[PDB]
């Protein structure tokens, strides 16, 4: 295909190391008839832009800037056998590596003098396992815990380090990199990550016609709660009316997207997908579920977002579960369809999610840049 | 830590007996540049005092009034062996005692003509248990049912008593003491309440300058729902247009707290928390979880409050969690961050929650006045 | 510390990415009163250097090249789901992450003709895991295997790839590199890999008096057997008389060494050792036991090898097990004691083994240059 759009956020997952990093590289490159964007809690961005003239509707699509991670603890001096540790918190999903990986310290840090600032880049932390105590429930607190210095006892410039912490998270360096015998797969964070930036690299290559927001957040590996679940509201209708005939007529006239991760079939893990499926270097799947998670994608959402994929060119894939499994996934849109906007549930296929590298495939993002991008035009 | 404040609580909470006897007890001493307040469900209060001028933001502030009890049903006559019983509903926490103490009928009863009028005091009730059959899953329905009456067959001026029982609840009587060997703890319910009684005793002693909120309600013990997550709207903005700039720009110009309780180490339970704890007679805990809790406080929000104890005298602490441990807690604000706001979730060294008695300090009150009344003023 | 030295193993591991890759990288180094050196089996390398006398002794001295990894089955092609995959063996050791990383092929591969050689080189192979299939005895076959390509149905010079799969393994790219905050550790495969490179760094750089013996080989992670226990015999004496008084008396004068690995207290799993430790950043601890594990290591051996540390400046430390505790760890001499020689069984303090990354401090490699470089010169 192109190693020219891969080469893309390849070095925006190096600026993007974390939510506000991503955040940060977010706006960096989405600058330059408005082309406007809302900041708010420095994590949840909101890209609009005009070309709502009312009863033409919005363009809505998003996806969240956070991943699960290890977030460091306010003050966790952990001393132990002449090593120093920070005490971390499980944020968002589980999974063993975490373990091993470069790990380095990111994000915001408020000084003294009520003033945030965020720092990163460097090797500076390791969590290292047990291995001859013979065959390896496991892991509960004291082994997430990853190792910085190392001695005692005491015998951007930035202040040294000190105890003014956090907000704070831990990420593996090693960037991001081409995988395979050929180019059939890459990535290492790219969790919903890249997804707030293939749609970055849509909102300034779309054919401008029509009014198109580009919403990131954070939360969403969590609860969602503030900034990716309420209020969407002002930020997005901040024009022409206040909350009378604003809403509701703009909205039903609107059509809101989802960029989420599909998994695909696994090639060792064959038996937990059915008949449709999704495997790496394809195009985005439409992911639908009503049963015990129920993502938003109706009939007239499935359609809509199909032969659109068509009409530029397929190939558009379609489901995620299974009957008796499959769980929660409240990936953004679906409780930001409080808004009241028929939601398309869609993503790319990649497995081996939260966690920080390992499969999705380096040919997806060629159709997701596409499609999306003629999602940005037509009535 | 003066005896004083501290003897306000104490017929604070005899009055508060419950949610709305608390709200009684609230707006009588919670009156006499506005100062007005909502009552609505007669159980959720918001207390708004002028001074939003738009451009200066709000200062929320807030707690539930319900607590962990013991909810008597509709028409529950229970006869059994000469004894004559009332069902209960197992309403918010579990645990034990319950078990025996003096145990009172309190609530808002709706009699034959379509009003509602509340009553409470006496001990009228108890709760028996066994003892020789010998060693003792303990407790399933039929064992919490209190024993009011104790006859057969049958050979505020108030109806006797009869059968309209209104929304009715059982507390137990001994009023709150005083406890230690010096002054060092004491306090009975105070679940919330308290913090919805200390915090109404700073609306009235803060230094008049800007627009404060005390946003009391019900149900955080159980869901929220209706009074504690929506609407807070209009409730508290009602001023200088409706929906369209009133919002987004005052609550971005905002800053809510939570007034919750914080544990701390426990003399017995020392591996229920991990480095930063918080042992009674102390500041408000700054509490801090994303992990699979998610309350609010962030990096701006620690730090605006902290430096904010510091420069009034601390001492401030934090955490209330484990890495492998840890769970739920949606205390109020954090579904009330739907508003937009950004928000504090402190409270107050205290253990044996969710009952009716045993452990919290005796001068954490002292500074729960302190900082959160000098909250109340500058930007 | 000393970043010179460790700036050595780095690129070493990097072309030392097999066992035989290690052989290659050891040998195109270790050139240039004799200083002949044994290859056979293009995998266990014995440098001799002369300068026995009979009864002057020898100065044995050796570690494995082989590390816990996944090897190549003969013909392993499974096409599953248009993935292209290569069975692998569990060669070694167990632990999860070989999951993720980079990975690559590499080997002595034999051609048709009778002739064998090797290749490496550029990611290619991958290992993907389940997520969202809810919480995860797992790790069975059919989870191991790496993905290569991904396509159907087909719509150094080197021969493309093929068919002709040598004794093929695979290992993570991501070349050494140094970690934590200042310089307190790094390495990433190191499994007395490394060992046969500062041992190797030390038969060059040793003051020439006496004869010394570098004795590299393979299986010791499996078995040992051919190569790396017996026949050691006429590969070290190959001079004046065969085995009529060769041995005896020159193997009883001779004093051999094990470089291996220790783990040292973890800071996370500080319930796996006693007393008698060994945290990174130290020098080569003298591992001691009998019980029901039986390494070497006796009376006059660990004194001869903690004065001759002392001499040269320290710190030697002791011990790896517990009473209890404890497994196997047939770590190269001991079966090859079966020579007739007393036996230093020391190492380096690292944990996380038997995988391919993380803990081994970057100071240890500057104790193990020195003394062992002291060994070299013993009267």
């Known amino acids: 295909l192109i190693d020219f759009l891969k080469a893309s956020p390849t070095p925006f997952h190096a600026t993007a190391s974390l939510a506000r990093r991503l955040e940060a590289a ?29 009863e033409s509707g919005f363009r809505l699509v998003g996806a969240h800037t ?57 090797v500076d932390f390791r969590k290292a396992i047990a291995v001859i105590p013979n065959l390896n429930p496991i892991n509960a607190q004291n082994e997430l815990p990853p190792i910085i210095a190392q001695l005692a006892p005491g015998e951007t410039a930035d202040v040294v380090l000190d105890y003014e912490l956090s907000f704070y998270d831990t990420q593996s360096a090693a960037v991001v990199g081409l995988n395979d015998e050929f180019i059939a797969g890459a990535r290492l964070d790219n969790l ?79 038996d937990r997908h059915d008949a449709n499926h999704g495997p790496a270097l394809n195009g985005g799947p439409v992911i639908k579920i009503n049963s015990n998670q129920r993502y938003a994608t109706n009939s007239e959402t499935a359609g809509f977002f199909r032969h659109l994929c068509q009409d530029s060119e397929v190939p558009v894939q379609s489901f995620v579960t299974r009957s008796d499994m499959g769980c929660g996934s409240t990936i953004g849109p679906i409780t930001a369809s409080q808004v009241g906007v028929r939601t398309v549930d869609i993503g790319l296929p990649t497995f081996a999610m939260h966690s920080i590298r390992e499969l999705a495939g380096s040919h997806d993002l060629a159709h997701l840049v596409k499609v999306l991008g003629a999602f940005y035009a037509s009535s």
């Open 26 to 54: 977010g706006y960096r490159r989405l600058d330059e008839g408005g082309r406007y964007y809302v900041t708010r809690n420095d994590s949840s961005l909101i890209a609009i832009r005009l070309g709502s003239p009312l």
């Open 66 to 122: 956070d991943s699960p991670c290890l977030r460091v603890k306010p003050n966790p001096e952990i001393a132990r056998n002449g090593f120093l540790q920070l005490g971390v918190e499980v944020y968002g999903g589980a999974l063993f590596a975490p373990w091993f990986d470069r790990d380095l310290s990111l994000a915001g840090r408020v000084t003294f003098r009520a003033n945030g600032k965020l720092e990163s880049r460097l």
């Open 192 to 270: 919903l990550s890249c997804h707030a930036g293939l749609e970055a690299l849509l909102n300034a290559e779309g054919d401008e016609n029509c009014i198109l927001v580009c919403t990131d957040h954070e939360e969403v590996g969590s609860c969602s709660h503030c900034g990716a679940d309420g209020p969407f509201l002002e930020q997005v209708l901040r024009r022409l009316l206040p909350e009378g005939d604003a809403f509701s007529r703009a909205i039903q006239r609107s059509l809101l997207v989802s960029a989420d991760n599909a998994h695909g079939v696994h090639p060792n893990y064959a």
